[PDB]
């Protein structure tokens, strides 16, 4: 992460760590959520904390909080990277990747494929039978 990002996350952490002791407990997470107009149960708060408490000591320190934010940012970036790739493959912007578009963009990526090979790729990913690859069909492949 950048210095900047670490700084914004340190500010956020400080808002949860009400007593300033360096860790966020389930009670402090309760106090933050109620201050936002929410009202979780104690079981729900233990469950939310469990997902972020990497070492299992029951509370969340700043390295664990930063690890949660870094993984959230990476998930958002991977999703954006796959969307951007789809928009680059869909050269005419109609929302579908055709066999001709896929053959052409693979050459830009350094792969010279035959029309039969690209047509096999289209049929493997084309789960609705329209002969083109739509965005969700593309995501399915890039996630497998």
**Residues interacting with Ca ion, by CB under 5 A?**
17, 19, 21, 53, 55, 57, 90, 92, 94, 96, 126, 128, 130, 134
- Which is closer to Ca ion, CB of 81 or CB of 128? 128
CB of 18 to Ca ion, least distance (A): 6
> Residue 16 class from Cβ within 10 Å (0-12 exposed, 13-18 middle, 19+ buried)?
middle
120 is in an annotated binding site: no
78 is in an annotated binding site: no
3-state SS, the chain, equals CCHHHHHHHHHHHHHHCCCCCCEECHHHHHHHHHHCCCCCCHHHHHHHHHHHCCCCCCCEEHHHHHHHHHHHHHHHHHHHHHHHHHHHHCCCCCCEECHHHHHHHHHHCCCCCCHHHHHHHHHHHCCCCCCCEEHHHHHHHHHC
Smallest separation, CB 75 to Ca ion (Å): 21
Is 39 one of the annotated binding-site residues?
Answer: no
* Identity of the residue, 84 or 92, whose beta carbon is nearer to Ca ion in the bound complex: 92
Supply the minimum distance, in Å, between the C-beta of residue 106 and Ca ion.
14
The verdict on whether residue 17 carries a ligand-binding annotation is yes
**Minimum distance of Ca ion from residue 114's CB (angstroms):** 20
Instruction: Name the binding residues for Ca(2+).
Output: 17, 19, 21, 23, 28, 53, 55, 57, 59, 64, 90, 92, 94, 101, 126, 128, 130, 132, 137
């Amino acid at each position: 992460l950048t210095e900047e990002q670490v700084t914004e996350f340190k500010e956020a952490f400080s808002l949860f760590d009400k007593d300033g002791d360096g860790c966020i407990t389930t009670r402090e997470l309760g106090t933050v959520m109620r201050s936002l107009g929410q009202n979780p149960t104690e079981a729900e708060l233990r469950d939310m904390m469990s997902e972020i408490d990497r070492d299992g000591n029951g509370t969340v320190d700043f390295p664990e909080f930063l690890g949660m934010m870094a993984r959230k940012m990476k998930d958002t970036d991977n999703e954006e990277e796959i969307r951007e790739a789809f928009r680059v493959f869909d050269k005419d912007g109609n929302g579908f990747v055709s066999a001709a578009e896929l053959r052409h963009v693979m050459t830009r990526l350094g792969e010279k494929l035959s029309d039969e090979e690209v047509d096999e790729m289209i049929r493997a990913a084309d789960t609705d039978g329209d002969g083109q690859v739509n965005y969700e069909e593309f995501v399915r492949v890039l996630v497998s």
